[PDB]
Write a protein that binds this ligand. Structure first.
Ligand SMILES: Cc1cn([C@H]2C[C@H](O)[C@@H](CO)O2)c(=O)[nH]c1=O
Ligand SMILES: Cc1cn([C@H]2C[C@H](O)[C@@H](CO)O2)c(=O)[nH]c1=O
Ligand SMILES: Cc1cn([C@H]2C[C@H](O)[C@@H](CO)O2)c(=O)[nH]c1=O
Ligand SMILES: Cc1cn([C@H]2C[C@H](O)[C@@H](CO)O2)c(=O)[nH]c1=O
Ligand SMILES: Cc1cn([C@H]2C[C@H](O)[C@@H](CO)O2)c(=O)[nH]c1=O
Ligand SMILES: Cc1cn([C@H]2C[C@H](O)[C@@H](CO)O2)c(=O)[nH]c1=O
Ligand SMILES: [Cl-]
Ligand SMILES: [Cl-]
Ligand SMILES: [Cl-]
Ligand SMILES: [Cl-]
Ligand SMILES: [Cl-]
Ligand SMILES: [Cl-]
Ligand SMILES: [Cl-]
Ligand SMILES: [Cl-]
Ligand SMILES: [Mg+2]
Ligand SMILES: [Mg+2]
Ligand SMILES: [Mg+2]
Ligand SMILES: [Mg+2]
Ligand SMILES: [Mg+2]
Ligand SMILES: [Mg+2]
Ligand SMILES: [Mg+2]
Ligand code: NA
Ligand code: NA
Ligand code: NA
Lengths: 252, 245, 251, 245, 251, 251
């Protein structure tokens, strides 16, 4: 009966939803919801915009997370309090491998925990791993969209800048831990950087929740060509089509 | 002349070198309107950005979202655009029985229960505010008539297990955080929030001046889950006034 | 042309690029004989090596011994000899009440309670299998009629304190591991073994494809002493499964 | 009721709740004589203890020896005897080019390159001074006419490799500390000393007020191997005066 | 009365309280036959176990396999069966230019580059031998005419990256271990092997006496390919030495 | 040069390459006077420095103060002046019931509960004595007639919480140290002091020879007060022992 503190929704508001799609950007919430039936705005507070919709007759929540594990952890927790058990993350990513192209899609098979919030759920030795059904559904949905799909490891960083070894910054400095790190992850086969998967996957895998992450590649750190506008727009649309279809696969 | 997330240019800031950085995008306009000629600049994601004038000087107000990661983006991008001083305001849960709802806390150092701070400095580095900003915040807070506590803040990457909340879906907390609230209480830590460790470490190690003031809206010795906010933002604007040179 | 420990050459492998890597040297022949033309290659230390053919393709079977360190040597040396895909089968103790003796587990990620994984990637790197291998193992395991669990495996450098066993010489468990079985249980961890963290981390960070499948021999919430016929049936099914998983991985 | 190391009783302190804690036992009498009625109490090991009176109030002066471990014993045992406020004075090497020999530094937070701080709080906890003490030290240092810097201090369990000195027997520095001076410099750290991390962490986590002020006697951008000390103790006594009320 | 892996019972050990624990199963019989009435007890996995008699006292010889994890099992199960003293002999690669191939090393402490030691004691605990065992080993080593070095051994969960070997499948060494051989050299570390940290930490924290002696088979500052006659001489001497160290311990 | 803290020159040491390093400045003269021609060299801060002659050879006696940090300065500066061997003597609290006040402990390895050791070697590195110094100290200690224990010492940067003392101002002990005394006791640790981890790690990683010997004057497990005579005898015996250990180290 309670209204969760941050998301401002009740369990009844979710109309029985046990699955949530959790993009990063609040603006993307409506966009995902309208790919389903009967999208209804529930609430917007802070970075959390929440809609409900229906997919093959089943209630689905779409809720933005904001950037980063901390804000993601709140949304996932409060949704879980309200009965959500499956969380499908969709979000943009920078690829770091030359073979991954802008417009491709990555389904994370495990995340490098370059975050802090994951540690609030499990010690570092615990794997930031998706639920296998979710990863499988995301792969299938991504392939069916016509996308080129990569399964692999994602580096999930609490920062956009030094943790992704960006030097074009105010200080131009990167702390010792992250100096040379992009090359190290590249050499280790890591596909991409984003900022939420380690927290999400660790939290869920250690809490009896099913989670997975799919991402559209919007830049490649190894390509000094500017991503074409059309490809990006197409990638935006494809990513959310894919996550909704992955949700469909998870429901039945 | 652009930044990746904030959607504003250096020109948009009209020479501002100080930012007030609340967490909640909805607080941005409220803070801006406490100043002169507030102007909406941009809103994208958790980042709503206004400018206003305070004693004739441009000040930026920019929300951070919850947590170190989104905060770190805002601070970096504001710094790219010339901002050098960052005044954090927000709400907080006190963990000391003598710190009351409505009191204000000015953080003298943060327990780094975050990940992003480590992306700027190793854990041994202190998450401490710039002394002038802390001084200005204490003065603004005290001058307002508030009851003000200076001290250590536990700054957590989570709202729930890292602040040892149990009224949660799993109802459990990982080993590291079991008993942690009592430990911080024993150690004299005043309060929990989610951004100061990142902000203070990032800034103290990057030649930026930062500080945090917080309004206490719950006492965790009383209960787990929750006018103070209005008073806090008046205080931070006065702190900004004191920082203006 | 030579490796330091395995005592086999690239030529001995006859072009094999896939290895099945059980823990027990005695299991190697058993696995090899599920395939065509099994040939004993070498046995040195804990490394017994056979080759066989699966649908006309050479497959190597090589034991790892117990633990990440000896596993890491075998994987490295096999990789030097051209092996790129590693299918681990091994016995395991389940820790979840709902995971029954005789069930099978395919590891989706390992809790890195080992040291050797850190020699390949820092702790934040996930000990996760190659998705194709995990998919092949799940399919093989399910097709066999087994009850199959996908999930997290706690992978320990010890059998005793790191798996929170107290019935030991000292009866002591270091602080780090006191209460750890309950913690992993609460976190949904399915089982304990002693090699997957090393194997999965090493491979995932080295451009090698790896996965682990295991037959549940005991459940820690029940008894430590397995029933002989049950164990035998589980072990036989597990090696049939890993061979079919290899079949699925063949190109 | 005589503490294990310091060789004094609570009665010996005549109600003092403030201590000045230099490192060198020889400085103890020198600080004490800046106050009224200095009396020698005890000398054992590196711990020389005097009492004196400052504006009518009893103050203890107690040396710490070099390093967190010996400092921790002195602070603990003084605290057992009623001391609640600890003012550290000492010498320091600056690592910033703009900080000059003769300048003073008031530590706003310490990089915890020590071990004893961890015996009081985990590394995440900030080695930060009490704000009142830091404020009093700044004011006292300024009023002496000293050039004063507020900022972060790297506090090392060694004088040599932990301060990245190479003119040593081995001439080498362990991986952790190779390039560390430059890293701290880049992060805006002002100086190196050896006690503040322990002192500040211990006190901040134990309900004790502490701060550190230091006279710069060498600039490490200039050389490795090293009036400043006279003025420094004047300043710390004046900071003590400000703390009393 | 039984154990989980070694396949021997307390009765099988005939009251032995001392074990010689080589790494290689094939070395077990070679050690046992230097004593009286050697008898094969069991061979399961990497664990080959013999008993013999030394000056009228039963001694067990039990291989460990490679690595701390398999070693920890052997030590634990032997301790369950009454063994209290563990003498490790094994081959090693020296990293100091002044330590020659054919020299012997008695470990005075190990750099804990392993994971299993942490399952017995946190990292700050010293991986230290029992002083009587180290003393006996030094004496035995010296009496054999060997050139003997007492000092620190780096004990790695891997043979390859943890010993900073680059001539590998990936040719990569994780950041932690890049430059590590030079660091250990500069710190006076004598040699690398893969079990002593686990063994010494486990034993020193569990009321068991342990020590490690090793013959230098290669020097990393020289060549990786040992000369056969030199290697054979060194290995023969090492097992003679460890049996004499056992004699000294049992006196 | 005159070293910065110790205030002595190389010439002042008259060729000494061995130092006895007690903690307490007041103990320096007492040790020096057990030898021939004791000469006061300097006193600054916690560093009182004497020279004396032992069998015609110059020996330095230099106090360290309490704790690794001040110890590290003294060892470094003496090493700059040619000192290569460092014999630590002091008193200690035992934590094992079988260790009696008046017994002596020679440290075979230290639990690194300090910070300064990390400034010389990472935590994995063992805080272990030079074998010759430990051997000499054991011999000197046993020849004195004392009961001598060889074993692990817990070396703490604090006297209070790091030794799990609760009779303190806050009565609080941080999580890391709660239950730690029982843990070290169960791991066979003999005693607590506050310098050995730093000293041993520093020296063992820097090509310096060091060891520690200590007289037991308190036992944390015994609720009886040791009498004056015993304590006096123990203090005197400890320094007689360290000087005899120095004699044994002279070349
Ligand atoms: C392009 C890119 C996006 N992201 C994530 C961060 C934000 O959440 C979002 C937009 O930048 O996508 C990265 O983390 N790294 C990248 O290189
Ligand atoms: C009331 C309260 C707020 N906060 C902070 C974190 C977020 O920035 C914001 C909303 O929860 O306030 C806490 O961290 N803990 C609390 O108990
Ligand atoms: C039954 C069982 C096996 N194992 C693994 C370890 C060895 O690799 C092998 C033999 O015990 O199986 C465990 O790790 N835990 C268990 O509970
Ligand atoms: C000059 C100087 C002093 N100190 C401090 C530590 C001791 O407390 C004291 C003696 O060196 O002064 C440093 O740590 N570094 C320095 O460079
Ligand atoms: C020669 C050599 C052996 N060893 C150990 C590992 C194995 O246990 C055994 C065989 O290689 O000896 C090393 O660890 N490093 C070496 O350089
Ligand atoms: C009695 C005792 C002494 N010590 C050491 C610390 C000092 O160096 C010296 C005096 O207390 O002896 C301990 O560390 N613990 C003890 O229990
Ligand atoms: Cl998004
Ligand atoms: Cl806010
Ligand atoms: Cl409340
Ligand atoms: Cl097996
Ligand atoms: Cl001083
Ligand atoms: Cl200078
Ligand atoms: Cl061997
Ligand atoms: Cl002493
Ligand atoms: Mg660098
Ligand atoms: Mg618990
Ligand atoms: Mg059941
Ligand atoms: Mg069942
Ligand atoms: Mg030579
Ligand atoms: Mg030679
Ligand atoms: Mg506790
Ligand atoms: Na956010
Ligand atoms: Na001292
Ligand atoms: Na093995």
């Amino acid at each position: 009966t309670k209204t969760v503190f941050h998301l401002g929704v009740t369990e009844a508001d979710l109309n029985g939803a046990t699955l949530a799609i959790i993009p990063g950007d609040p603006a993307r919430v409506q966009k995902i919801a309208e790919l389903m039936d009967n999208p209804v705005f529930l609430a917007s507070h802070r970075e959390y915009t929440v809609y409900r919709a229906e997919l093959d007759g089943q209630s689905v929540v779409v809720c933005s997370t904001g950037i980063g594990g901390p804000s993601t952890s709140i949304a996932v927790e409060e949704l879980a309090q309200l009965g959500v058990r499956t969380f499908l993350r969709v979000g943009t990513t920078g690829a770091i491998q030359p073979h991954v192209n802008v417009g491709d899609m990555i389904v994370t098979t495990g995340s490098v925990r370059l975050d802090g919030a994951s540690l609030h759920f499990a010690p570092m030795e615990f794997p930031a791993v998706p639920d296998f059904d979710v990863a499988t559904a995301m792969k299938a949905a991504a392939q069916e969209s016509g996308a080129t799909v990569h399964m692999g490891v994602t580096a999930s960083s609490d920062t956009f800048y030094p943790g992704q070894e960006r030097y074009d910054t105010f200080t131009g400095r990167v702390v010792r831990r992250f100096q040379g790190s992009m090359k190290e992850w590249q050499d280790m086969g890591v596909l991409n950087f984003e900022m939420e998967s380690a927290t999400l996957l660790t939290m869920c895998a250690s809490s009896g929740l099913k989670a997975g992450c799919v991402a559209g590649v919007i830049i490649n750190r190894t390509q000094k060509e500017i991503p074409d506008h059309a490809t990006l727009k197409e990638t935006e649309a494809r990513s959310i089509k894919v996550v909704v279809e992955a949700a469909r696969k998870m429901l039945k």
